[PDB]
């Protein structure tokens, strides 16, 4: 019945999924922060 | 260099469908991704080194 329980319930492996989910949005925010002007004329060094 | 868009990278053929009133393309960085030639009317693609 272990195989049936694993194949039926789709949220049994939730602890392992959070570990890999928390390590993607961190990089996503770290790369999205590059579009902030930080109180400057522009966010592009070449333009400045 | 395209009308004051200094940069560095390779230029390659692109198949993006720009609109007549559109000229530039962007990924999510506020950084240029696709540019259109001034003299000829064809869409280029920019990829870093």
UniProtKB/Swiss-Prot annotation, chain A:
Domain of life: Viruses
Positions in coiled-coil regions: 17-48
Renumbered residue ranges of the record's region Heptad repeat 1: 1-38
Job description of the protein: Subunit of the fusion protein that is processed upon entry into the host cell. Mediates fusion of the virion and cellular membranes by functioning as a class I viral fusion protein. Contains a viral fusion peptide that is unmasked after S2 cleavage. This cleavage can occur at the cell membrane by host TMPRSS2 or during endocytosis by host CSTL. In either case, this triggers an extensive and irreversible conformational change that leads to fusion of the viral envelope with the cellular cytoplasmic membrane, releasing viral genomic RNA into the host cell cytoplasm.
Protein name: Spike protein S2'
Entire-sequence positions represented here: 933 to 980 of 1273
């Amino acid at each position: 019945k272990i195989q049936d329980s694993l194949s039926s319930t789709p949220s049994a492996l939730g602890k392992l999924q959070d570990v890999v989910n928390h390590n993607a949005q961190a990089l996503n925010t770290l790369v999205k922060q590059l579009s902030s002007k930080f109180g400057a004329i522009s966010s592009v060094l070449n333009d400045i | 260099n395209f009308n004051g868009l200094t940069g560095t990278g390779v230029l390659t053929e692109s198949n993006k469908k720009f609109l007549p009133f559109q000229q530039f393309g962007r990924d999510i960085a506020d950084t240029t991704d696709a540019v259109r030639d001034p003299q000829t009317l064809e869409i280029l693609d920019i990829t870093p080194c």
